[PDB]
């Protein structure tokens, strides 16, 4: 029979497709090992799970069942490391409420 490589590694993200994608970015004569794909898939899955967990907590706070870009922005900008890593613009997020003490 056939056993997928992601099942052997114990992941959800694909190992074969990521291997094929990595082989297309090597300059000129360049080979790619079989255990670079496993490392890359594990990294991507870890980061995805972290962001999704924070966003789900933010959504649960507001008594809502689904996730929207507002919750993604609230989750990202409330964490120091995620804020440092992600500096892009999220279309539909807005700003975190904050009013200076001198103006009040």
């Amino acid at each position: 029979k056939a056993v997928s490589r992601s099942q052997r590694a114990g992941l959800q993200f694909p190992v074969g497709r990521i291997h094929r994608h990595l082989k297309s970015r090597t300059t000129s004569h360049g080979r790619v090992g079989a255990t670079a794909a496993v490392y890359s898939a594990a990294i991507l899955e870890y980061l995805t799970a972290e962001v999704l967990e924070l966003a789900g907590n933010a959504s649960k706070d507001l008594k809502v069942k689904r996730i929207t870009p507002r919750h993604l922005q609230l989750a990202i900008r409330g964490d120091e490391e995620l804020d440092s890593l992600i500096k892009a613009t999220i279309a539909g997020g807005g700003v975190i409420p904050h009013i200076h003490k001198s103006l009040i």
Partner: protein
């Protein structure tokens, strides 16, 4: 088309300032805001039209804008990638 920069009214600038967190506003802020907006738009649109012209096309797509914004250092999530 002429003097289209005056369609960025004074209430719109006041709303953007309020979301920025500004309590009082002077009377000469609006012209400065219009100037800075024009400069920003000119840079980005120039790069987007260059990207479109390279591909031998006549329609400006969302991906040219996304690529130009990534070039200037202003990555945007939501419209492609």
């Amino acid at each position: 088309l002429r003097d289209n920069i005056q369609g960025i009214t004074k209430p719109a600038i006041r709303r953007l300032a309020r979301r920025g967190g500004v309590k009082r506003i002077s009377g000469l802020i609006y012209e400065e805001t219009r100037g800075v907006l024009k400069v920003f738009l000119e840079n980005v649109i120039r790069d987007a039209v260059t990207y479109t012209e390279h591909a031998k096309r006549k329609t400006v797509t969302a991906m040219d804008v996304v690529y130009a914004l990534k070039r200037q250092g202003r990555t945007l999530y939501g419209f492609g990638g």
